[PDB]
Amino acid sequence: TSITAYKSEGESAEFSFPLNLGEESLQGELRWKAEKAPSSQSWITFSLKNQKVSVQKSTSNPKFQLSETLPLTLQIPQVSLQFAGSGNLTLTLDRGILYQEVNLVVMKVTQPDSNTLTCEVMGPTSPKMRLILKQENQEARVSRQEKVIQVQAPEAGVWQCLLSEGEEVKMDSKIQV
């Protein structure tokens, strides 16, 4: 089921749904819940006929983009902490309602003044997930088990910011301070 896409702001998230591509025709719908402003209405309606995907009136916020053919890739295109959350991609009567869960977690690293270095993430994170601000190739300076960690008066250099679950680093992002 589930699929998670980890991205730094300003990047593209692209999900790929690669299931049982026979001669199928579908009606498909994707609806999204953006994490802090859960203003319901995000969706895209599309249809499949002969391997050509098509969109029946979609939404515009975020601008979901669908692949005009198989394989059915949905791409949210210039990610932002404000679009992180998750949604389900319902597929239809292929034979029944086939479904997929989809998520997007977003990281934002900033140097707000020069006392501050910040790293914040938004979206669906496990609680065995911690944020880490490190110097480019050195060791973790801060490793807090929160969603926004901060570092006081960072030494000039490449800092890196990482999201890890267990010994698994889900993602990272660098900044030159």
Curated annotation (Swiss-Prot):
The keyword Glycoprotein applies. GO terms for cellular component: cell surface; endoplasmic reticulum lumen; endoplasmic reticulum membrane; external side of plasma membrane; membrane raft; plasma membrane. One of its GO terms (biological process) is calcium-mediated signaling. It is found in: Cell membrane. Its main location: membrane. Disulfide bonds join C119-C161. It comes from the Eukaryota. The Ig-like V-type domain mediates the interaction with MHCII. Forms disulfide-linked homodimers at the cell surface. Interacts with LCK. Interacts with PTK2/FAK1. Binds to P4HB/PDI. Interacts with IL16; this interaction induces a CD4-dependent signaling in lymphocytes. Interacts (via Ig-like V-type domain) with MHCII alpha chain (via alpha-2 domain) and beta chain (via beta-2 domain); this interaction increases the affinity of TCR for peptide-MHCII. CD4 oligomerization via Ig-like C2-type 2 and 3 domains appears to be required for stable binding to MHCII and adhesion between T cells and APCs. This is T-cell surface glycoprotein CD4. The gene is Cd4.
